[PDB]
Amino acid sequence: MNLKQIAKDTAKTLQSYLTYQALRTVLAQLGETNPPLALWLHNFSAGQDGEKYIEELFLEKPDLALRIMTVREHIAEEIAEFLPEMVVTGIQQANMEKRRQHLERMTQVSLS
Amino acid sequence: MNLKQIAKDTAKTLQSYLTYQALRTVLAQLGETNPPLALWLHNFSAGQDGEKYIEELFLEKPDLALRIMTVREHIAEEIAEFLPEMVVTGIQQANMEKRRQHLERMTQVSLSH
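^ Those are the sequences you sent over. The predicted structure of the assembly is below.
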């Protein structure tokens, strides 16, 4: 169990997923503002490890890459502080749904 | 935009990823003390929303689902507190290296002769 490699890989996976989220937000925002570019961006994007995506966008439309950069970072800065509790308590509760499900099934059988 | 959904969906993805990562380390803790079980687990596993994965393992080998449950929770406990800084600063750096790459290129072009 390489706890330090797991953390690295998790952080990476999260940066990439938030770039993804930054990508749909701007897609939306550009659906209402400049639908020709919005379609282009829809068109451009399919396939994204978040860093490789942005690097590719930067060559085509720099100002557009900057904007994904701004959003992914504004999103991260807003949600980050909640991640630990959500995930630790989320796993703990979900761990517990399963044991309680198993106990009901067990109790439904034995007591019927 | 919908920050509340984004946080929920991020958490859920994270939670799924850590289950996946829990699987890898038990898969390898057994790789030692039981290759039949290991291969069984390996075979069963290919194809992975982490809660649906565990609910399915629970019907075949409850004790093995419980072990994944325990390892997933342990991993999260250990790494969770670092994640906020790692993501916020990882993005800020990667953002910044992207501006510096662009500057250095501009610099390479305007100044080279």
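The longest helix of chain A spans residues 3-32. Chain A touches chain B through 48 residues (CB under 8 Å).

Shout if you want it in another format.
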